[PDB]
Design an enzyme around this catalytic site. Sequence first.
Site, PDB file in Angstrom:
ATOM      1  N   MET A   1      -6.143  10.287  18.431  1.00 29.88           N
ATOM      2  CA  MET A   1      -5.174  10.782  19.399  1.00 29.88           C
ATOM      3  C   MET A   1      -3.748  10.563  18.930  1.00 29.88           C
ATOM      4  SD  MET A   1      -7.091   9.528  22.868  1.00 29.88           S
ATOM      5  CE  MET A   1      -5.707   9.856  23.921  1.00 29.88           C
TER       6      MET A   1
ATOM      7  N   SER B   1      16.259  14.219   6.470  1.00 35.00           N
ATOM      8  CA  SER B   1      14.910  14.600   6.856  1.00 35.00           C
ATOM      9  C   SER B   1      14.075  13.385   7.254  1.00 35.00           C
ATOM     10  CB  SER B   1      14.191  15.417   5.806  1.00 35.00           C
ATOM     11  OG  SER B   1      13.665  14.651   4.752  1.00 35.00           O
TER      12      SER B   1
ATOM     13  N   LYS C   1      -2.696  10.193  15.803  1.00 37.59           N
ATOM     14  CA  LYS C   1      -2.371  11.111  14.686  1.00 37.59           C
ATOM     15  C   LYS C   1      -2.199  12.540  15.132  1.00 37.59           C
ATOM     16  CE  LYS C   1      -2.036   8.272  11.158  1.00 37.59           C
ATOM     17  NZ  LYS C   1      -0.683   7.791  10.717  1.00 37.59           N
TER      18      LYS C   1
ATOM     19  N   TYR D   1      -6.968   6.105  17.598  1.00 36.77           N
ATOM     20  CA  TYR D   1      -6.261   6.407  16.331  1.00 36.77           C
ATOM     21  C   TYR D   1      -6.080   7.890  16.188  1.00 36.77           C
ATOM     22  CZ  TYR D   1      -5.764   7.379  11.400  1.00 36.77           C
ATOM     23  OH  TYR D   1      -5.358   7.908  10.204  1.00 36.77           O
TER      24      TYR D   1
ATOM     25  N   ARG E   1       0.817  -1.193   0.000  1.00 31.88           N
ATOM     26  CA  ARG E   1       0.000   0.000   0.000  1.00 31.88           C
ATOM     27  C   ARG E   1       0.855   1.250   0.000  1.00 31.88           C
ATOM     28  NH1 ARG E   1      -5.439  -0.443   1.245  1.00 31.88           N
ATOM     29  NH2 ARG E   1      -5.339   1.069   2.988  1.00 31.88           N
TER      30      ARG E   1
ATOM     31  N   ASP F   1      -2.769  12.679   8.872  1.00 31.30           N
ATOM     32  CA  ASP F   1      -4.119  12.424   8.432  1.00 31.30           C
ATOM     33  C   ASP F   1      -4.787  13.780   8.230  1.00 31.30           C
ATOM     34  OD1 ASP F   1      -6.855  11.794   8.169  1.00 31.30           O
ATOM     35  OD2 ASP F   1      -6.695  10.038   9.482  1.00 31.30           O
TER      36      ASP F   1
HETATM   37  N1  NAP Z   1      -5.170   4.792   3.336  1.00 27.14           N
HETATM   38  C1  NAP Z   1      -5.614   6.035   3.571  1.00 27.14           C
HETATM   39  O1  NAP Z   1      -6.601   6.522   2.939  1.00 27.14           O
HETATM   40  C2  NAP Z   1      -4.983   6.905   4.618  1.00 27.14           C
HETATM   41  C3  NAP Z   1      -5.694   8.044   5.034  1.00 27.14           C
HETATM   42  C4  NAP Z   1      -5.148   8.877   5.996  1.00 27.14           C
HETATM   43  C5  NAP Z   1      -3.898   8.652   6.504  1.00 27.14           C
HETATM   44  N2  NAP Z   1      -3.204   7.530   6.052  1.00 27.14           N
HETATM   45  C6  NAP Z   1      -1.898   7.194   6.695  1.00 27.14           C
HETATM   46  O2  NAP Z   1      -0.968   6.866   5.702  1.00 27.14           O
HETATM   47  C7  NAP Z   1      -0.153   5.755   6.191  1.00 27.14           C
HETATM   48  C8  NAP Z   1      -0.274   4.608   5.242  1.00 27.14           C
HETATM   49  O3  NAP Z   1      -1.637   4.180   5.089  1.00 27.14           O
HETATM   50  P1  NAP Z   1      -1.985   2.728   4.595  1.00 27.14           P
HETATM   51  O4  NAP Z   1      -3.449   2.682   4.368  1.00 27.14           O
HETATM   52  O5  NAP Z   1      -1.036   2.302   3.545  1.00 27.14           O
HETATM   53  O6  NAP Z   1      -1.615   1.916   5.968  1.00 27.14           O
HETATM   54  P2  NAP Z   1      -2.116   0.430   6.362  1.00 27.14           P
HETATM   55  O7  NAP Z   1      -2.180  -0.396   5.152  1.00 27.14           O
HETATM   56  O8  NAP Z   1      -3.343   0.530   7.215  1.00 27.14           O
HETATM   57  O9  NAP Z   1      -0.937  -0.018   7.326  1.00 27.14           O
HETATM   58  C9  NAP Z   1       0.419   0.058   6.858  1.00 27.14           C
HETATM   59  C10 NAP Z   1       1.265  -0.989   7.564  1.00 27.14           C
HETATM   60  O10 NAP Z   1       1.337  -0.683   8.957  1.00 27.14           O
HETATM   61  C11 NAP Z   1       1.925  -1.854   9.539  1.00 27.14           C
HETATM   62  N3  NAP Z   1       1.567  -1.897  10.968  1.00 27.14           N
HETATM   63  C12 NAP Z   1       0.352  -1.973  11.515  1.00 27.14           C
HETATM   64  N4  NAP Z   1       0.394  -2.277  12.802  1.00 27.14           N
HETATM   65  C13 NAP Z   1       1.738  -2.431  13.083  1.00 27.14           C
HETATM   66  C14 NAP Z   1       2.408  -2.829  14.243  1.00 27.14           C
HETATM   67  N5  NAP Z   1       1.826  -3.236  15.364  1.00 27.14           N
HETATM   68  N6  NAP Z   1       3.751  -2.821  14.168  1.00 27.14           N
HETATM   69  C15 NAP Z   1       4.370  -2.489  13.038  1.00 27.14           C
HETATM   70  N7  NAP Z   1       3.791  -2.144  11.871  1.00 27.14           N
HETATM   71  C16 NAP Z   1       2.472  -2.140  11.945  1.00 27.14           C
HETATM   72  C17 NAP Z   1       1.468  -3.059   8.733  1.00 27.14           C
HETATM   73  O11 NAP Z   1       2.620  -3.787   8.368  1.00 27.14           O
HETATM   74  P3  NAP Z   1       2.532  -5.375   8.046  1.00 27.14           P
HETATM   75  O12 NAP Z   1       1.544  -5.476   6.895  1.00 27.14           O
HETATM   76  O13 NAP Z   1       3.955  -5.753   7.672  1.00 27.14           O
HETATM   77  O14 NAP Z   1       2.047  -6.080   9.304  1.00 27.14           O
HETATM   78  C18 NAP Z   1       0.744  -2.410   7.546  1.00 27.14           C
HETATM   79  O15 NAP Z   1       0.923  -3.048   6.300  1.00 27.14           O
HETATM   80  C19 NAP Z   1      -0.637   5.465   7.595  1.00 27.14           C
HETATM   81  O16 NAP Z   1       0.128   6.186   8.555  1.00 27.14           O
HETATM   82  C20 NAP Z   1      -2.043   5.993   7.608  1.00 27.14           C
HETATM   83  O17 NAP Z   1      -2.548   6.333   8.867  1.00 27.14           O
HETATM   84  C21 NAP Z   1      -3.743   6.685   5.150  1.00 27.14           C
HETATM   85  N1  LYA Z   2      -3.406   3.080   8.884  1.00 28.67           N
HETATM   86  C1  LYA Z   2      -4.468   3.580   8.226  1.00 28.67           C
HETATM   87  N2  LYA Z   2      -5.073   2.824   7.278  1.00 28.67           N
HETATM   88  C2  LYA Z   2      -6.160   3.220   6.517  1.00 28.67           C
HETATM   89  O1  LYA Z   2      -6.646   2.393   5.680  1.00 28.67           O
HETATM   90  C3  LYA Z   2      -6.643   4.523   6.796  1.00 28.67           C
HETATM   91  C4  LYA Z   2      -7.701   5.315   6.316  1.00 28.67           C
HETATM   92  C5  LYA Z   2      -8.670   4.962   5.199  1.00 28.67           C
HETATM   93  C6  LYA Z   2      -9.967   5.766   5.240  1.00 28.67           C
HETATM   94  C7  LYA Z   2     -11.054   5.277   6.111  1.00 28.67           C
HETATM   95  C8  LYA Z   2     -11.782   6.131   6.929  1.00 28.67           C
HETATM   96  C9  LYA Z   2     -12.774   5.621   7.760  1.00 28.67           C
HETATM   97  C10 LYA Z   2     -13.037   4.256   7.771  1.00 28.67           C
HETATM   98  C11 LYA Z   2     -14.167   3.622   8.572  1.00 28.67           C
HETATM   99  O2  LYA Z   2     -15.212   4.242   8.736  1.00 28.67           O
HETATM  100  N3  LYA Z   2     -13.958   2.389   8.991  1.00 28.67           N
HETATM  101  C12 LYA Z   2     -15.017   1.636   9.675  1.00 28.67           C
HETATM  102  C13 LYA Z   2     -16.002   0.998   8.692  1.00 28.67           C
HETATM  103  C14 LYA Z   2     -15.370   0.282   7.501  1.00 28.67           C
HETATM  104  C15 LYA Z   2     -16.353  -0.299   6.487  1.00 28.67           C
HETATM  105  O3  LYA Z   2     -17.528   0.168   6.529  1.00 28.67           O
HETATM  106  O4  LYA Z   2     -15.972  -1.210   5.690  1.00 28.67           O
HETATM  107  C16 LYA Z   2     -14.332   0.572  10.531  1.00 28.67           C
HETATM  108  O5  LYA Z   2     -15.034   0.190  11.489  1.00 28.67           O
HETATM  109  O6  LYA Z   2     -13.200   0.182  10.172  1.00 28.67           O
HETATM  110  C17 LYA Z   2     -12.308   3.401   6.952  1.00 28.67           C
HETATM  111  C18 LYA Z   2     -11.317   3.911   6.122  1.00 28.67           C
HETATM  112  C19 LYA Z   2      -7.676   6.443   7.061  1.00 28.67           C
HETATM  113  N4  LYA Z   2      -6.607   6.412   7.915  1.00 28.67           N
HETATM  114  C20 LYA Z   2      -5.978   5.234   7.782  1.00 28.67           C
HETATM  115  N5  LYA Z   2      -4.893   4.818   8.525  1.00 28.67           N
END
Ligand code: NAP
Ligand code: LYA
Lengths: 251, 252, 250, 249
Positions: free
Chosen positions: C158, C137, C160, C156, C13, C143
């Site tokens: 808190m 850097s 972020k 979560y 991802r 988020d």
């Molecule tokens: N996806 C979005 O729309 C979104 C939105 C807002 C912010 N972000 C931020 O952007 C970043 C990347 O998002 P993403 O969706 O790619 O993340 P993700 O798929 O939810 O998680 C990324 C990786 O975090 C690792 N991780 C989780 N728990 C861990 C633990 N206990 N110890 C060590 N590693 C751990 C996992 O590694 P393993 O698979 O190797 O276990 C996982 O593959 C995150 O910081 C997220 O909060 C994402």
């Molecule tokens: N680490 C990390 N990984 C992510 O994928 C992620 C996102 C993705 C966006 C996002 C926001 C809200 C819910 C949401 O409402 N989730 C609910 C319902 C999900 C559903 O209806 O399928 C949940 O209970 O997970 C699910 C996803 C934000 N921040 C993230 N940080």
Amino acid sequence: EAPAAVVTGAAKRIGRAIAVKLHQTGYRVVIHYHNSAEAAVSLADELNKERSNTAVVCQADLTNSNVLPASCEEIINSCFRAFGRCDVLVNNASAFYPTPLVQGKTVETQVAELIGTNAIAPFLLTMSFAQRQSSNLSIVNLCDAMVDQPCMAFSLYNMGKHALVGLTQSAALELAPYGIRVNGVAPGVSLLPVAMGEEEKDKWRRKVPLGRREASAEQIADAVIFLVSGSAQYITGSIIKVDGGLSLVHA
Amino acid sequence: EAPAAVVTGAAKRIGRAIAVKLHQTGYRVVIHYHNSAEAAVSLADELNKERSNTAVVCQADLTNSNVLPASCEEIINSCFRAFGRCDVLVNNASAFYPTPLVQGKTVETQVAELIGTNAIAPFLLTMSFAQRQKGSNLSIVNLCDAMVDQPCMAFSLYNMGKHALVGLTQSAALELAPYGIRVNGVAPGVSLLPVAMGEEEKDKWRRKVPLGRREASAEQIADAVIFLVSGSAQYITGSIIKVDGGLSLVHA
Amino acid sequence: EAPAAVVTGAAKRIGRAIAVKLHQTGYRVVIHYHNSAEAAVSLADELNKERSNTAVVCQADLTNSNVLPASCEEIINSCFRAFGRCDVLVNNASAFYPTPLVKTVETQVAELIGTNAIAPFLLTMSFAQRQKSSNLSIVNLCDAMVDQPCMAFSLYNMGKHALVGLTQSAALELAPYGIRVNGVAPGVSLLPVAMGEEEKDKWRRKVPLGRREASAEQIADAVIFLVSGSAQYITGSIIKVDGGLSLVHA
Amino acid sequence: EAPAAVVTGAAKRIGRAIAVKLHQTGYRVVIHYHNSAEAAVSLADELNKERSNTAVVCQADLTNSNVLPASCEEIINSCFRAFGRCDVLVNNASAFYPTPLVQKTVETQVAELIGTNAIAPFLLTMSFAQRQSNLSIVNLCDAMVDQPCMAFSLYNMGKHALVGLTQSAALELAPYGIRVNGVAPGVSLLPVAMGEEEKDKWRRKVPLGRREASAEQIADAVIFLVSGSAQYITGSIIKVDGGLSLVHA
Ligand SMILES: NC(=O)c1ccc[n+]([C@@H]2O[C@H](COP(=O)([O-])OP(=O)(O)OC[C@H]3O[C@@H](n4cnc5c(N)ncnc54)[C@H](OP(=O)(O)O)[C@@H]3O)[C@@H](O)[C@H]2O)c1
Ligand SMILES: Nc1nc(=O)c2c(CCc3ccc(C(=O)N[C@@H](CCC(=O)O)C(=O)O)cc3)c[nH]c2[nH]1
Ligand SMILES: NC(=O)c1ccc[n+]([C@@H]2O[C@H](COP(=O)([O-])OP(=O)(O)OC[C@H]3O[C@@H](n4cnc5c(N)ncnc54)[C@H](OP(=O)(O)O)[C@@H]3O)[C@@H](O)[C@H]2O)c1
Ligand SMILES: NC(=O)c1ccc[n+]([C@@H]2O[C@H](COP(=O)([O-])OP(=O)(O)OC[C@H]3O[C@@H](n4cnc5c(N)ncnc54)[C@H](OP(=O)(O)O)[C@@H]3O)[C@@H](O)[C@H]2O)c1
Ligand SMILES: NC(=O)c1ccc[n+]([C@@H]2O[C@H](COP(=O)([O-])OP(=O)(O)OC[C@H]3O[C@@H](n4cnc5c(N)ncnc54)[C@H](OP(=O)(O)O)[C@@H]3O)[C@@H](O)[C@H]2O)c1
Ligand SMILES: Nc1nc(=O)c2c(CCc3ccc(C(=O)N[C@@H](CCC(=O)O)C(=O)O)cc3)c[nH]c2[nH]1
Ligand SMILES: Nc1nc(=O)c2c(CCc3ccc(C(=O)N[C@@H](CCC(=O)O)C(=O)O)cc3)c[nH]c2[nH]1
Ligand SMILES: Nc1nc(=O)c2c(CCc3ccc(C(=O)N[C@@H](CCC(=O)O)C(=O)O)cc3)c[nH]c2[nH]1
């Protein structure tokens, strides 16, 4: 075909740096100016020497008045007349001087200049830019990283820059369906005013955590170039501080 | 001697409730109005029936123009003339309507009205207020907008005006602190909805509010104004208090 | 000689896209992972096929615990042992799930606050202690919706918010060492893998700019900018990459 | 019947002033403390002399640990045990000391700074909500959270996390009629260990009067937020900083 950009207040300082960097990136540029004719023409000459017919100047006062909408429309029209397109608008021009609340220009003129240049002209230019419109269209507003830690006696300037935050966000929202991104670059201290004594410049420089120095004009321009680039295609409504940490420093 | 307050746009709605609560707290009040003369005078009659000679009206357009500085000086002067002092200024009056960026009033008129009422007149009033104290619990309260960073579609000039008002609140707090004048804001989310808004649209907004699924009463907005002008807020300056039921925390 | 970067949670991802783009830019990479060993290893093999001896993996749990400081020091150390230097740290790894106010709660605290905040802090500590032409850097994955939180995601959120604080605090304290500290704040980028398309579409329809989520690559583009020579005066800044989503009222 | 409030870290300084002003307003109070037993008992004695059976003390360490949930549950339980209700929670207790990034164990520093400033407020919020008028929570924030002091990263992280909790809990607990707000001092009572010259340096920074806030001025904002005059306010953080946060470097 090369894209085209308007940069307001582009004869000198940060606006020149932005025009030069856009030109180096491959843009044709409209160098808007108000009083700095000789400087604007010297810059255009230099850019046209590098690549023929890629720079024009455009003079306009951006003080608020009932003809400001027509003047802003004409600036955008000048880009289409010269280059057939207008891809990028950079709102850089800015009046800047103190307006103390407690006690030479009338206060009406101060309002017109400070609010006009920093907020109303950006708004009108944004309207005209949008009205005239693969593609990568965007606007970049020159904000101020210190907008929430204002300088003493600069109320109208600060009001103008706060309004410009609002425009950036409002326009990002409203123009997103047209594919026009709207972002900001917020310097802390970059080039200090020409009139400032060296000791006062050094007082500002000593406050900057990252290097104890002001941003070069080019460093500001680097953030503008990022935001107009394909590397920022999902970025809209964002204001990037380019301030060396200055805004994080407590009193 | 009772303190005195100016409230702009005080004939109706939130401004009226602010004027009423200030008066109930013991202030003498200047009720500013633009078009709503009948309602301004009816408010003054109600307040003067409670305590004689404690409410006056003052008419002015707060659109930006060549005469706006003079108009704002005369509003502040009206308080000194009536009451011999001016302790509190409440910048409440506000033009509010959409100004789309893409396509009866010209855009420059819209600039004058929306930026004048929401930002420039507050600035000029602030200047005149301070200058008349240029030599006690003095303060200014600006009516802001809790939704300033999640603006309504096609409201760019309004939004610019409210953003400018945040900047004025902060700039004036800093500059006027040495004079002991505090400058704060109250930021509604949804309170009294516009009278021309359809009942269906009003309910759509109410349903968004986490706390109670309803808009703020004008009195709840006024309560925050009363706090900020009180002795319980004497260390508070440059603060903007949201009174929004959580609305600004709700994502899209 | 080539700079080196650590990317946490880099097997899949957004982390994976960041590691790829850094490698394409010329960095040697440490691919940290927790559970996704096969994916981490497949990424490393792909990158080393492109350029030999330019990618390694490093396993660690980033949950808060008594051993987390040592785990974080070892991640940084792995970059030095592999590459002789550590120029960039990207704090991407993140636990994400709801924790309603009304797994034990202490485990949820440990995982959500550990991954999103405390491990970033400890990694930052270790990064800087080894640094007690250069362009050093840190980039924290924040988020954009941190002030418009999702319902029942308090821990979560808190974590972020704490990460914003870390970004700013570390930018201030590490500036004298020439280490910049910035953030990238997605709105919606890649949606959770099992989320139904109808739920993904509810999010997509809210995004002003194109009514779509960000690709992982678009998030990585902002990380690349922040670590580049074109960002050398930028520190303590958090760049939203959100398509305007954070501007949209309820 | 009189409402009841829990104030954490209430033996001294700002927490004491908050407990006093709530009591003067008509609340029964739980005076939580950690090490300041004598002061906590002294306060309870003072308040009970004014109105009998209106104040109790409750000891707890609010450092993060696997027992912190149980400790926070017990603080809330202690309010129900004494008073049969719990209307207000004030999260005031706070560890505060520098944690430089470049050089107690680091794990202990994390536990204390993040525990007291963020995790304990979260667990106390959970327990408050689960055990349920004018119900509300007030969190003691920091007006300087975005202009942090040098080498205070963990403290600053904790306060930033507290902003997040304030907002998240406001959203989640609104359907239950529980408001959640903050009060953000700039400089109020300076640390007892700070030297006089350093205290004067901070005072001189404050635009409004070149002085720190009294503990009572901070308590005044807490009183407002718990009152009926704040019934539509949730998710708001009120700075009480004399303009300090507006002052550039
Ligand atoms: N996806 C979005 O729309 C979104 C939105 C807002 C912010 N972000 C931020 O952007 C970043 C990347 O998002 P993403 O969706 O790619 O993340 P993700 O798929 O939810 O998680 C990324 C990786 O975090 C690792 N991780 C989780 N728990 C861990 C633990 N206990 N110890 C060590 N590693 C751990 C996992 O590694 P393993 O698979 O190797 O276990 C996982 O593959 C995150 O910081 C997220 O909060 C994402
Ligand atoms: N680490 C990390 N990984 C992510 O994928 C992620 C996102 C993705 C966006 C996002 C926001 C809200 C819910 C949401 O409402 N989730 C609910 C319902 C999900 C559903 O209806 O399928 C949940 O209970 O997970 C699910 C996803 C934000 N921040 C993230 N940080
Ligand atoms: N310099 C800094 O450290 C700093 C800090 C924070 C933010 N910024 C922002 O960054 C931008 C560039 O800063 P800068 O220092 O380079 O700006 P600047 O030199 O102060 O002003 C730029 C130009 O604005 C034009 N301008 C002023 N009044 C005008 C008017 N009435 N009509 C039209 N144009 C007018 C002038 O054009 P002519 O010379 O042709 O008359 C001038 O050259 C500005 O928006 C500024 O607010 C700068
Ligand atoms: N209502 C809400 O939910 C809400 C939400 C967010 C913020 N606010 C803010 O709270 C304040 C009060 O809101 P409201 O809804 O009560 O306001 P409103 O009814 O829209 O307007 C208040 C008054 O402003 C005066 N006004 C408008 N244009 C003027 C002009 N050109 N010159 C002088 N006065 C002018 C009018 O006075 P006359 O009638 O005498 O002409 C009007 O009655 C405003 O600042 C508003 O922006 C309100
Ligand atoms: N003072 C200021 O200028 C200022 C500025 C900004 C923000 N604030 C915030 O306002 C609040 C009050 O400030 P203050 O200066 O009055 O606070 P303080 O005196 O530094 O600390 C308050 C109390 O916290 C308790 N505490 C510390 N560690 C604890 C632990 N491990 N477990 C349980 N309780 C613990 C202590 O209780 P015992 O004494 O019983 O051990 C202490 O008396 C704090 O949240 C602070 O961050 C204050
Ligand atoms: N358009 C624009 N141009 C700029 O040069 C600029 C700056 C430069 C930074 C800056 C900040 C404060 C003062 C300051 O304190 N000015 C005071 C004192 C000056 C002195 O001591 O020389 C003033 O009265 O100008 C002077 C300069 C910020 N925003 C700007 N926007
Ligand atoms: N002075 C003043 N008076 C007010 O009545 C007021 C309000 C009330 C709230 C409000 C919000 C949206 C729309 C509205 O018209 N919305 C648009 C849809 C666009 C959108 O909401 O994004 C509409 O046409 O309904 C109309 C009113 C906010 N600020 C104000 N300031
Ligand atoms: N719980 C709690 N208790 C408090 O007493 C308190 C304060 C008081 C204000 C305060 C500010 C700076 C320093 C300080 O130590 N400054 C460093 C210098 C670093 C800098 O100020 O940037 C110092 O050594 O003085 C010490 C105290 C803020 N938040 C607090 N929270």
